[PDB]
Amino acid sequence: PAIRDSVPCRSQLNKRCCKGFCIDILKRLAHTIGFSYDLYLVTNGKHGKKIDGVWNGMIGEVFYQRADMAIGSLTINEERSEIVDFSVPFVETGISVMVARSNGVDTVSGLSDRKFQRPQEQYPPLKFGTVPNGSTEKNIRSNYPDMHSYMVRYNQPRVEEALTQLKAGKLDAFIYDAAVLNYMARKDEGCKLVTIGSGKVFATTGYGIALHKGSRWKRPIDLALLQFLGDDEIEMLERLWLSGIC
Amino acid sequence: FCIDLLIKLARTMNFTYEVHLVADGKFGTQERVNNSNKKEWNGMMGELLSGQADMIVAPLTINNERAQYIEFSKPFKYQGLTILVKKEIPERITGINDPRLRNPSDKFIYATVKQSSVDIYFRRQVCLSTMYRHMEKHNYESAAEAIQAVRDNKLHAFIWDSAVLEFEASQKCDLVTTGELFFRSGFGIGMRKDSPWKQNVSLSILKSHEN
Protein backbone atom coordinates (compact mmCIF):
# COMPACT_ATOMS: atom_id res chain seq x y z
CA PRO A 1 0.00 0.00 0.00
CA ALA A 2 0.99 3.60 -0.66
CA ILE A 3 7.97 3.05 0.88
CA ARG A 4 10.99 4.16 -1.14
CA ASP A 5 13.04 2.12 -3.63
CA SER A 6 9.73 0.83 -5.02
CA VAL A 7 8.19 1.69 -8.39
CA PRO A 8 4.87 3.57 -8.07
CA CYS A 9 2.46 1.13 -9.72
CA ARG A 10 -1.06 2.31 -10.56
CA SER A 11 -3.85 -0.25 -10.03
CA GLN A 12 -6.42 0.61 -12.71
CA LEU A 13 -8.84 -2.16 -11.78
CA ASN A 14 -12.15 -2.09 -13.65
CA LYS A 15 -1.30 3.97 -6.74
CA ARG A 16 0.40 1.21 -4.75
CA CYS A 17 4.16 0.63 -4.60
CA CYS A 18 5.59 -2.43 -6.36
CA LYS A 19 8.97 -3.92 -5.46
CA GLY A 20 10.57 -7.30 -5.99
CA PHE A 21 13.15 -9.36 -7.82
CA CYS A 22 11.50 -8.91 -11.21
CA ILE A 23 10.92 -5.25 -10.35
CA ASP A 24 14.65 -4.85 -9.67
CA ILE A 25 15.47 -6.63 -12.93
CA LEU A 26 13.15 -4.30 -14.84
CA LYS A 27 14.70 -1.28 -13.12
CA ARG A 28 18.21 -2.45 -14.03
CA LEU A 29 17.12 -3.01 -17.63
CA ALA A 30 15.61 0.48 -17.75
CA HIS A 31 18.83 1.98 -16.37
CA THR A 32 20.88 0.11 -18.97
CA ILE A 33 18.48 1.24 -21.72
CA GLY A 34 17.33 4.65 -20.42
CA PHE A 35 13.66 4.16 -21.31
CA SER A 36 10.62 5.54 -19.51
CA TYR A 37 7.71 3.30 -18.54
CA ASP A 38 4.57 3.14 -16.46
CA LEU A 39 3.70 0.05 -14.41
CA TYR A 40 0.43 -1.45 -15.61
CA LEU A 41 -1.16 -3.70 -12.99
CA VAL A 42 -3.09 -6.77 -14.11
CA THR A 43 -6.31 -7.04 -12.10
CA ASN A 44 -8.83 -9.17 -14.05
CA GLY A 45 -7.07 -12.45 -13.41
CA LYS A 46 -3.38 -13.26 -13.10
CA HIS A 47 -2.27 -14.51 -16.53
CA GLY A 48 -5.44 -15.60 -18.32
CA LYS A 49 -5.97 -18.32 -20.92
CA LYS A 50 -7.90 -18.50 -24.18
CA ILE A 51 -11.23 -18.35 -22.34
CA ASP A 52 -13.80 -19.36 -24.98
CA GLY A 53 -11.21 -18.44 -27.59
CA VAL A 54 -10.64 -15.05 -25.91
CA TRP A 55 -7.54 -14.29 -23.87
CA ASN A 56 -7.86 -12.52 -20.52
CA GLY A 57 -5.55 -11.30 -17.78
CA MET A 58 -1.93 -10.86 -18.80
CA ILE A 59 -2.45 -12.13 -22.34
CA GLY A 60 -5.82 -10.39 -22.52
CA GLU A 61 -4.00 -7.10 -21.98
CA VAL A 62 -0.79 -7.56 -23.97
CA PHE A 63 -2.16 -9.59 -26.89
CA TYR A 64 -5.15 -7.28 -27.36
CA GLN A 65 -2.66 -4.38 -27.18
CA ARG A 66 -4.17 -3.03 -23.96
CA ALA A 67 -0.59 -3.39 -22.70
CA ASP A 68 2.77 -3.40 -24.48
CA MET A 69 5.37 -4.77 -22.05
CA ALA A 70 4.83 -7.76 -19.77
CA ILE A 71 6.67 -9.07 -16.72
CA GLY A 72 5.95 -11.78 -14.17
CA SER A 73 5.43 -15.55 -14.20
CA LEU A 74 5.19 -15.58 -17.99
CA THR A 75 5.52 -19.25 -18.86
CA ILE A 76 6.95 -19.93 -22.32
CA ASN A 77 4.84 -22.29 -24.43
CA GLU A 78 3.49 -22.70 -27.94
CA GLU A 79 -0.03 -21.74 -26.85
CA ARG A 80 1.30 -18.43 -25.48
CA SER A 81 4.25 -17.51 -27.72
CA GLU A 82 2.46 -17.91 -31.07
CA ILE A 83 0.70 -14.55 -30.63
CA VAL A 84 3.09 -12.65 -28.32
CA ASP A 85 6.84 -12.76 -28.85
CA PHE A 86 8.74 -13.85 -25.74
CA SER A 87 12.19 -12.62 -24.75
CA VAL A 88 15.00 -14.86 -23.53
CA PRO A 89 14.02 -16.58 -20.26
CA PHE A 90 15.97 -14.71 -17.59
CA VAL A 91 15.04 -17.35 -14.99
CA GLU A 92 14.34 -21.07 -15.31
CA THR A 93 11.35 -22.98 -13.95
CA GLY A 94 9.14 -25.94 -14.76
CA ILE A 95 6.68 -28.32 -13.10
CA SER A 96 7.40 -29.79 -9.66
CA VAL A 97 5.40 -31.24 -6.77
CA MET A 98 5.00 -29.64 -3.34
CA VAL A 99 4.66 -32.41 -0.74
CA ALA A 100 4.70 -32.68 3.04
CA ARG A 101 7.88 -32.83 5.11
CA SER A 102 9.76 -36.04 5.92
CA ASN A 103 6.80 -37.77 7.62
CA GLY A 104 5.04 -40.36 5.47
CA VAL A 105 9.72 -40.17 -0.64
CA ASP A 106 6.76 -42.38 -1.53
CA THR A 107 6.41 -44.81 -4.45
CA VAL A 108 5.27 -41.98 -6.74
CA SER A 109 7.36 -41.70 -9.93
CA GLY A 110 6.23 -38.18 -10.77
CA LEU A 111 3.59 -37.66 -13.42
CA SER A 112 4.75 -40.94 -14.99
CA ASP A 113 3.83 -42.85 -11.82
CA ARG A 114 2.08 -46.17 -12.35
CA LYS A 115 -0.28 -45.25 -9.51
CA PHE A 116 -1.38 -42.19 -11.48
CA GLN A 117 -2.25 -44.36 -14.48
CA ARG A 118 -3.58 -47.16 -12.23
CA PRO A 119 -5.24 -45.57 -9.17
CA GLN A 120 -7.03 -48.79 -8.22
CA GLU A 121 -5.32 -49.22 -4.84
CA GLN A 122 -6.80 -48.29 -1.47
CA TYR A 123 -4.97 -44.94 -1.27
CA PRO A 124 -3.66 -43.74 -4.64
CA PRO A 125 -2.01 -40.32 -5.04
CA LEU A 126 -4.48 -37.70 -6.27
CA LYS A 127 -6.15 -34.43 -5.20
CA PHE A 128 -3.56 -31.85 -6.23
CA GLY A 129 -4.98 -28.36 -5.70
CA THR A 130 -4.27 -26.98 -9.16
CA VAL A 131 -5.07 -23.27 -9.56
CA PRO A 132 -7.98 -22.57 -11.95
CA ASN A 133 -7.09 -21.13 -15.37
CA GLY A 134 -3.41 -21.69 -14.66
CA SER A 135 -0.52 -22.47 -16.97
CA THR A 136 0.27 -25.77 -15.23
CA GLU A 137 -3.41 -26.70 -15.41
CA LYS A 138 -3.32 -26.27 -19.18
CA ASN A 139 -0.05 -28.21 -19.34
CA ILE A 140 -1.45 -31.23 -17.49
CA ARG A 141 -4.72 -31.01 -19.43
CA SER A 142 -2.87 -31.08 -22.75
CA ASN A 143 -0.36 -33.77 -21.77
CA TYR A 144 -2.74 -35.99 -19.75
CA PRO A 145 -6.41 -34.98 -19.98
CA ASP A 146 -7.47 -38.29 -18.42
CA MET A 147 -5.23 -37.84 -15.38
CA HIS A 148 -6.59 -34.37 -14.65
CA SER A 149 -10.16 -35.52 -15.32
CA TYR A 150 -9.88 -38.40 -12.84
CA MET A 151 -8.58 -36.12 -10.05
CA VAL A 152 -10.67 -33.07 -11.02
CA ARG A 153 -12.22 -33.05 -7.53
CA TYR A 154 -9.63 -31.05 -5.57
CA ASN A 155 -9.01 -27.64 -3.97
CA GLN A 156 -8.67 -25.24 -6.90
CA PRO A 157 -8.83 -21.66 -5.51
CA ARG A 158 -5.53 -20.69 -3.88
CA VAL A 159 -1.90 -21.77 -3.62
CA GLU A 160 -1.58 -20.59 -0.01
CA GLU A 161 -4.69 -22.47 1.08
CA ALA A 162 -3.25 -25.55 -0.66
CA LEU A 163 -0.07 -25.07 1.38
CA THR A 164 -2.18 -24.88 4.55
CA GLN A 165 -4.02 -28.08 3.59
CA LEU A 166 -0.70 -29.81 2.90
CA LYS A 167 0.56 -28.69 6.32
CA ALA A 168 -2.65 -30.11 7.81
CA GLY A 169 -2.31 -33.24 5.67
CA LYS A 170 -5.60 -32.69 3.85
CA LEU A 171 -3.89 -33.09 0.47
CA ASP A 172 -1.08 -35.57 -0.10
CA ALA A 173 0.69 -33.36 -2.65
CA PHE A 174 0.18 -30.51 -5.11
CA ILE A 175 1.76 -30.32 -8.56
CA TYR A 176 2.53 -26.76 -9.66
CA ASP A 177 5.27 -24.57 -11.11
CA ALA A 178 8.77 -25.66 -10.12
CA ALA A 179 10.15 -22.23 -9.17
CA VAL A 180 7.35 -21.11 -6.84
CA LEU A 181 7.07 -24.54 -5.20
CA ASN A 182 10.84 -24.66 -4.66
CA TYR A 183 10.89 -21.17 -3.14
CA MET A 184 7.96 -21.99 -0.84
CA ALA A 185 9.58 -25.26 0.25
CA ARG A 186 12.83 -23.42 0.98
CA LYS A 187 10.86 -20.78 2.91
CA ASP A 188 8.10 -22.81 4.59
CA GLU A 189 8.77 -23.87 8.17
CA GLY A 190 9.05 -27.54 9.07
CA CYS A 191 11.27 -28.32 6.05
CA LYS A 192 8.49 -29.14 3.61
CA LEU A 193 10.04 -31.67 1.26
CA VAL A 194 10.50 -31.29 -2.49
CA THR A 195 9.15 -33.98 -4.83
CA ILE A 196 10.71 -37.46 -5.08
CA GLY A 197 13.64 -35.87 -6.94
CA SER A 198 15.22 -32.72 -5.54
CA GLY A 199 16.49 -31.79 -9.00
CA LYS A 200 13.61 -33.53 -10.77
CA VAL A 201 11.51 -31.11 -12.83
CA PHE A 202 8.96 -31.90 -15.54
CA ALA A 203 8.65 -29.97 -18.81
CA THR A 204 11.41 -27.54 -17.91
CA THR A 205 10.75 -24.00 -19.17
CA GLY A 206 11.65 -20.41 -18.35
CA TYR A 207 10.20 -16.99 -17.61
CA GLY A 208 10.73 -14.26 -20.19
CA ILE A 209 9.59 -10.68 -20.76
CA ALA A 210 6.69 -10.75 -23.23
CA LEU A 211 7.19 -7.75 -25.49
CA HIS A 212 4.91 -6.86 -28.38
CA LYS A 213 4.78 -9.32 -31.27
CA GLY A 214 7.62 -8.15 -33.50
CA SER A 215 8.94 -5.56 -31.05
CA ARG A 216 12.22 -4.08 -32.29
CA TRP A 217 13.63 -3.72 -28.76
CA LYS A 218 13.32 -7.48 -28.17
CA ARG A 219 16.73 -8.32 -29.65
CA PRO A 220 18.79 -5.66 -27.79
CA ILE A 221 17.06 -6.24 -24.44
CA ASP A 222 17.94 -9.94 -24.43
CA LEU A 223 21.55 -8.98 -25.12
CA ALA A 224 21.41 -6.51 -22.24
CA LEU A 225 19.74 -9.22 -20.17
CA LEU A 226 22.58 -11.60 -20.92
CA GLN A 227 24.92 -8.67 -20.31
CA PHE A 228 23.98 -9.25 -16.67
CA LEU A 229 24.78 -12.91 -17.29
CA GLY A 230 27.97 -11.58 -18.87
CA ASP A 231 28.96 -10.22 -15.46
CA ASP A 232 26.78 -12.52 -13.30
CA GLU A 233 24.92 -9.45 -12.02
CA ILE A 234 21.78 -11.42 -11.06
CA GLU A 235 23.47 -13.86 -8.67
CA MET A 236 22.78 -11.88 -5.50
CA LEU A 237 19.14 -11.23 -6.43
CA GLU A 238 18.64 -14.91 -7.24
CA ARG A 239 20.16 -15.84 -3.88
CA LEU A 240 17.93 -13.33 -2.07
CA TRP A 241 14.73 -14.50 -3.77
CA LEU A 242 15.51 -18.22 -3.92
CA SER A 243 17.56 -19.30 -0.89
CA GLY A 244 15.74 -20.65 2.14
CA ILE A 245 16.38 -22.10 5.60
CA CYS A 246 14.05 -25.06 6.18
CA PHE B 1 21.35 -35.78 -28.61
CA CYS B 2 21.77 -33.15 -31.33
CA ILE B 3 21.31 -35.85 -33.97
CA ASP B 4 18.04 -36.91 -32.33
CA LEU B 5 16.86 -33.30 -32.16
CA LEU B 6 17.70 -32.61 -35.80
CA ILE B 7 16.07 -35.80 -37.09
CA LYS B 8 12.99 -34.97 -35.01
CA LEU B 9 12.92 -31.52 -36.62
CA ALA B 10 13.40 -32.91 -40.13
CA ARG B 11 10.44 -35.18 -39.44
CA THR B 12 8.53 -32.20 -38.02
CA MET B 13 8.72 -29.46 -40.67
CA ASN B 14 9.95 -31.73 -43.51
CA PHE B 15 13.34 -30.15 -44.20
CA THR B 16 16.11 -32.08 -45.93
CA TYR B 17 19.51 -32.05 -44.28
CA GLU B 18 23.19 -32.42 -45.14
CA VAL B 19 25.14 -33.19 -41.96
CA HIS B 20 28.84 -32.38 -41.74
CA LEU B 21 31.45 -31.68 -39.08
CA VAL B 22 34.02 -28.90 -38.68
CA ALA B 23 37.73 -29.42 -39.32
CA ASP B 24 39.05 -26.95 -36.73
CA GLY B 25 37.32 -28.79 -33.88
CA LYS B 26 36.62 -25.57 -31.97
CA PHE B 27 33.54 -23.52 -31.15
CA GLY B 28 35.25 -20.28 -32.14
CA THR B 29 35.67 -16.78 -30.74
CA GLN B 30 36.50 -13.21 -31.68
CA GLU B 31 40.26 -13.58 -32.12
CA ARG B 32 42.50 -11.07 -33.91
CA VAL B 33 44.35 -13.80 -35.80
CA ASN B 34 47.67 -13.27 -37.56
CA ASN B 35 47.58 -11.18 -40.75
CA SER B 36 44.22 -9.74 -39.68
CA ASN B 37 43.07 -6.29 -38.61
CA LYS B 38 40.32 -7.06 -36.08
CA LYS B 39 38.92 -10.05 -34.21
CA GLU B 40 37.08 -12.59 -36.38
CA TRP B 41 34.68 -15.30 -35.27
CA ASN B 42 36.14 -18.79 -35.69
CA GLY B 43 34.94 -22.37 -35.52
CA MET B 44 31.33 -23.37 -36.04
CA MET B 45 29.99 -19.87 -35.39
CA GLY B 46 32.54 -18.48 -37.84
CA GLU B 47 31.39 -20.93 -40.50
CA LEU B 48 27.73 -20.11 -39.83
CA LEU B 49 28.47 -16.38 -40.12
CA SER B 50 30.33 -17.09 -43.36
CA GLY B 51 27.28 -19.05 -44.54
CA GLN B 52 29.08 -22.39 -44.79
CA ALA B 53 26.20 -24.08 -42.95
CA ASP B 54 22.57 -23.02 -42.77
CA MET B 55 22.52 -23.36 -38.97
CA ILE B 56 24.56 -24.85 -36.13
CA VAL B 57 23.20 -27.82 -34.17
CA ALA B 58 25.59 -28.31 -31.26
CA PRO B 59 25.69 -27.99 -27.46
CA LEU B 60 26.21 -24.24 -27.80
CA THR B 61 26.05 -21.89 -24.82
CA ILE B 62 23.74 -18.91 -25.29
CA ASN B 63 25.87 -15.76 -25.25
CA ASN B 64 25.03 -12.29 -26.54
CA GLU B 65 28.35 -12.07 -28.39
CA ARG B 66 27.00 -14.47 -31.01
CA ALA B 67 23.43 -13.17 -30.60
CA GLN B 68 24.53 -9.86 -32.14
CA TYR B 69 24.55 -11.71 -35.47
CA ILE B 70 23.19 -15.24 -34.77
CA GLU B 71 19.53 -15.94 -34.05
CA PHE B 72 19.02 -18.14 -30.99
CA SER B 73 15.76 -19.91 -30.19
CA LYS B 74 14.71 -21.19 -26.77
CA PRO B 75 17.36 -23.51 -25.28
CA PHE B 76 16.91 -27.19 -26.08
CA LYS B 77 18.18 -28.12 -22.61
CA TYR B 78 19.25 -26.35 -19.42
CA GLN B 79 22.57 -26.71 -17.62
CA GLY B 80 25.06 -24.84 -15.47
CA LEU B 81 28.78 -24.92 -14.73
CA THR B 82 30.92 -27.10 -12.47
CA ILE B 83 34.43 -28.55 -12.22
CA LEU B 84 35.35 -32.14 -12.98
CA VAL B 85 37.98 -33.27 -10.48
CA LYS B 86 39.50 -36.56 -9.29
CA LYS B 87 38.55 -36.18 -5.62
CA GLU B 88 38.33 -39.75 -4.34
CA ILE B 89 39.34 -41.40 -1.07
CA PRO B 90 42.26 -43.30 -2.56
CA GLU B 91 40.05 -30.29 -0.17
CA ARG B 92 40.88 -29.17 -3.70
CA ILE B 93 37.85 -26.90 -4.26
CA THR B 94 35.04 -26.62 -1.72
CA GLY B 95 33.04 -24.28 -3.94
CA ILE B 96 33.05 -21.09 -5.96
CA ASN B 97 34.48 -19.24 -2.94
CA ASP B 98 37.37 -21.67 -2.45
CA PRO B 99 40.67 -19.76 -2.10
CA ARG B 100 42.29 -22.11 -4.61
CA LEU B 101 39.68 -21.00 -7.14
CA ARG B 102 40.33 -17.39 -6.15
CA ASN B 103 44.13 -17.68 -5.93
CA PRO B 104 45.90 -19.36 -8.87
CA SER B 105 48.81 -21.69 -8.21
CA ASP B 106 50.85 -24.40 -9.91
CA LYS B 107 49.54 -27.10 -7.55
CA PHE B 108 46.36 -27.33 -9.64
CA ILE B 109 46.02 -27.08 -13.42
CA TYR B 110 42.75 -25.34 -14.23
CA ALA B 111 41.81 -25.92 -17.87
CA THR B 112 38.99 -25.37 -20.34
CA VAL B 113 38.49 -26.21 -24.00
CA LYS B 114 40.23 -23.73 -26.28
CA GLN B 115 37.91 -21.35 -28.16
CA SER B 116 34.92 -22.01 -25.91
CA SER B 117 32.09 -19.88 -24.55
CA VAL B 118 33.23 -20.60 -20.99
CA ASP B 119 36.70 -19.35 -21.91
CA ILE B 120 35.30 -16.07 -23.25
CA TYR B 121 33.07 -15.72 -20.18
CA PHE B 122 36.12 -16.12 -17.95
CA ARG B 123 37.96 -13.59 -20.11
CA ARG B 124 35.14 -11.09 -19.55
CA GLN B 125 34.77 -12.18 -15.91
CA VAL B 126 36.01 -9.37 -13.68
CA CYS B 127 38.23 -9.89 -10.61
CA LEU B 128 39.44 -13.18 -12.14
CA SER B 129 41.98 -12.15 -14.78
CA THR B 130 44.32 -14.52 -12.94
CA MET B 131 41.94 -17.32 -13.93
CA TYR B 132 42.13 -16.07 -17.52
CA ARG B 133 45.93 -16.23 -17.37
CA HIS B 134 45.67 -19.75 -15.94
CA MET B 135 43.44 -20.66 -18.88
CA GLU B 136 45.87 -19.14 -21.37
CA LYS B 137 48.82 -21.04 -19.88
CA HIS B 138 46.95 -24.31 -19.23
CA ASN B 139 43.96 -24.61 -21.59
CA TYR B 140 43.13 -28.07 -22.92
CA GLU B 141 42.70 -28.40 -26.67
CA SER B 142 39.57 -30.54 -26.22
CA ALA B 143 37.11 -31.73 -23.60
CA ALA B 144 38.03 -35.39 -24.16
CA GLU B 145 41.72 -34.82 -23.44
CA ALA B 146 40.86 -32.81 -20.32
CA ILE B 147 38.53 -35.59 -19.12
CA GLN B 148 41.25 -38.18 -19.72
CA ALA B 149 43.83 -36.08 -17.87
CA VAL B 150 41.50 -35.57 -14.89
CA ARG B 151 40.61 -39.27 -14.85
CA ASP B 152 44.29 -40.28 -14.61
CA ASN B 153 45.30 -37.21 -12.53
CA LYS B 154 47.29 -35.20 -15.08
CA LEU B 155 44.73 -32.39 -14.79
CA HIS B 156 43.75 -31.38 -11.26
CA ALA B 157 40.56 -29.58 -12.32
CA PHE B 158 38.52 -29.05 -15.49
CA ILE B 159 35.88 -26.31 -15.52
CA TRP B 160 33.05 -27.47 -17.75
CA ASP B 161 29.30 -27.30 -18.23
CA SER B 162 27.23 -28.98 -15.53
CA ALA B 163 25.19 -31.43 -17.60
CA VAL B 164 27.91 -32.79 -19.90
CA LEU B 165 30.56 -33.01 -17.18
CA GLU B 166 28.12 -34.70 -14.79
CA PHE B 167 27.10 -37.23 -17.45
CA GLU B 168 30.74 -37.98 -18.29
CA ALA B 169 31.64 -38.41 -14.62
CA SER B 170 28.68 -40.74 -14.09
CA GLN B 171 29.44 -42.75 -17.24
CA LYS B 172 33.19 -43.23 -16.75
CA CYS B 173 33.09 -43.07 -12.91
CA ASP B 174 36.42 -42.75 -11.06
CA LEU B 175 35.70 -39.00 -10.99
CA VAL B 176 33.62 -36.41 -9.14
CA THR B 177 32.11 -33.00 -9.90
CA THR B 178 32.41 -30.00 -7.59
CA GLY B 179 30.76 -26.60 -7.54
CA GLU B 180 27.05 -25.94 -7.98
CA LEU B 181 25.35 -24.32 -10.98
CA PHE B 182 26.98 -20.95 -10.43
CA PHE B 183 26.21 -19.97 -14.06
CA ARG B 184 22.79 -21.21 -15.14
CA SER B 185 22.43 -21.32 -18.93
CA GLY B 186 20.88 -23.30 -21.75
CA PHE B 187 21.86 -25.20 -24.87
CA GLY B 188 19.74 -24.12 -27.81
CA ILE B 189 19.95 -23.66 -31.58
CA GLY B 190 21.83 -21.11 -33.64
CA MET B 191 20.76 -19.92 -37.09
CA ARG B 192 21.51 -17.06 -39.45
CA LYS B 193 20.18 -13.64 -38.50
CA ASP B 194 16.42 -13.28 -39.10
CA SER B 195 16.05 -16.91 -40.15
CA PRO B 196 12.31 -17.57 -40.68
CA TRP B 197 12.54 -21.23 -39.66
CA LYS B 198 14.20 -20.51 -36.30
CA GLN B 199 10.90 -19.31 -34.83
CA ASN B 200 9.33 -22.63 -35.82
CA VAL B 201 12.34 -24.38 -34.28
CA SER B 202 11.70 -22.43 -31.08
CA LEU B 203 8.14 -23.74 -31.07
CA SER B 204 9.50 -27.21 -31.80
CA ILE B 205 11.76 -26.78 -28.76
CA LEU B 206 8.66 -26.23 -26.64
CA LYS B 207 7.13 -29.28 -28.32
CA SER B 208 10.10 -31.31 -27.11
CA HIS B 209 9.59 -29.89 -23.63
CA GLU B 210 5.96 -30.90 -24.09
CA ASN B 211 6.94 -34.28 -25.56
From Swiss-Prot, chain A:
Residues involved in L-glutamate binding: S73, T75, R80, S135, T136, D177
Q: List all topological domains (Extracellular).
A: 105-246
Q: Glycosylation positions?
A: N14, N103
Q: List the disulfide bonds.
A: C9-C18, C191-C246
The cellular location(s) given in this protein's UniProt record come to:
Cell membrane; Postsynaptic cell membrane
Q: What is the effect of changing L13V?
A: Found in a patient with schizophrenia; uncertain significance
The family classification in the record reads: Belongs to the glutamate-gated ion channel (TC 1.A.10.1) family. NR2D/GRIN2D subfamily.
Entry note about domains: A hydrophobic region that gives rise to the prediction of a transmembrane span does not cross the membrane, but is part of a discontinuously helical region that dips into the membrane and is probably part of the pore and of the selectivity filter.
Q: What does this protein do?
A: Component of N-methyl-D-aspartate (NMDA) receptors (NMDARs) that function as heterotetrameric, ligand-gated cation channels with high calcium permeability and voltage-dependent block by Mg(2+). Participates in synaptic plasticity for learning and memory formation. Channel activation requires binding of the neurotransmitter L-glutamate to the GluN2 subunit, glycine or D-serine binding to the GluN1 subunit, plus membrane depolarization to eliminate channel inhibition by Mg(2+). NMDARs mediate simultaneously the potasium efflux and the influx of calcium and sodium.
- Tell me which disease this protein is linked to: Developmental and epileptic encephalopathy 46: A form of epileptic encephalopathy, a heterogeneous group of severe early-onset epilepsies characterized by refractory seizures, neurodevelopmental impairment, and poor prognosis. Development is normal prior to seizure onset, after which cognitive and motor delays become apparent.
Description of how the protein assembles with itself and partners: Heterotetramer. Forms heterotetrameric channels composed of two GluN1/zeta subunits (GRIN1), and two identical GluN2/epsilon subunits (GRIN2A, GRIN2B, GRIN2C or GRIN2D) or GluN3 subunits (GRIN3A or GRIN3B) (in vitro). In vivo, the subunit composition may depend on the expression levels of the different subunits. Interacts with PDZ domains of PATJ and DLG4.
- What is the protein named? Glutamate receptor ionotropic, NMDA 2D
Q: Which organism is it from?
A: Homo sapiens
Its taxonomic path starts at: Eukaryota, Metazoa, Chordata, Craniata, Vertebrata
Section covered of the full-length record: 447 to 828 of 1336
Curated annotation (Swiss-Prot), chain B:
According to its UniProt record, how is this protein modified after translation?
NMDA is probably regulated by C-terminal phosphorylation of an isoform of GRIN1 by PKC. Its phosphorylated state is influenced by the formation of the NMDAR-PPP2CB complex and the NMDAR channel activity.
Query: What top-level branch of life does the organism fall under?
Result: Eukaryota
Its subcellular locations are:
Cell membrane; Postsynaptic cell membrane; Postsynaptic density membrane; Synaptic cell membrane
Q: Extracellular topology: which positions?
A: 91-211
What are the binding positions for glycine in this chain? P59, T61, R66, S117, D161
Q: Which residues are glycosylated?
A: N14, N34, N103, N200
Task: Describe the task this protein carries out.
Answer: Component of N-methyl-D-aspartate (NMDA) receptors (NMDARs) that function as heterotetrameric, ligand-gated cation channels with high calcium permeability and voltage-dependent block by Mg(2+). NMDARs participate in synaptic plasticity for learning and memory formation by contributing to the long-term potentiation (LTP). Channel activation requires binding of the neurotransmitter L-glutamate to the GluN2 subunit, glycine or D-serine binding to the GluN1 subunit, plus membrane depolarization to eliminate channel inhibition by Mg(2+).
Q: Which family does it belong to?
A: Belongs to the glutamate-gated ion channel (TC 1.A.10.1) family. NR1/GRIN1 subfamily.
Q: What is known of its domains?
A: A hydrophobic region that gives rise to the prediction of a transmembrane span does not cross the membrane, but is part of a discontinuously helical region that dips into the membrane and is probably part of the pore and of the selectivity filter. The extracellular N-terminal domain (NTD) is a site of allosteric regulation to modulate overall receptor function.
State whether it acts alone or in a complex, and with which partners, per the record: Heterotetramer; the NMDAR subunits are modular and harbor tiered domains that function in concert to regulate opening and closing of the cation-selective ion channel pore. Forms heterotetrameric channels composed of two GluN1/zeta subunits (GRIN1), and two identical GluN2/epsilon subunits (GRIN2A, GRIN2B, GRIN2C or GRIN2D) or GluN3 subunits (GRIN3A or GRIN3B) (in vitro). Can also form heterotetrameric channels that contain at least two GluN1 subunits and at least two different GluN2 subunits (or a combination of one GluN2 and one GluN3 subunits) (in vitro).
Q: Which disease is it linked to?
A: Neurodevelopmental disorder with or without hyperkinetic movements and seizures, autosomal dominant: An autosomal dominant neurodevelopmental disorder characterized by severe intellectual disability and developmental delay, absent speech, muscular hypotonia, dyskinesia, and hyperkinetic movements. Cortical blindness, cerebral atrophy, and seizures are present in some patients.
Q: Any idea what this protein is called? A: Glutamate receptor ionotropic, NMDA 1
The organism of origin for this protein: Homo sapiens
- What taxonomic ancestry is recorded? Eukaryota, Metazoa, Chordata, Craniata, Vertebrata
The gene is: GRIN1
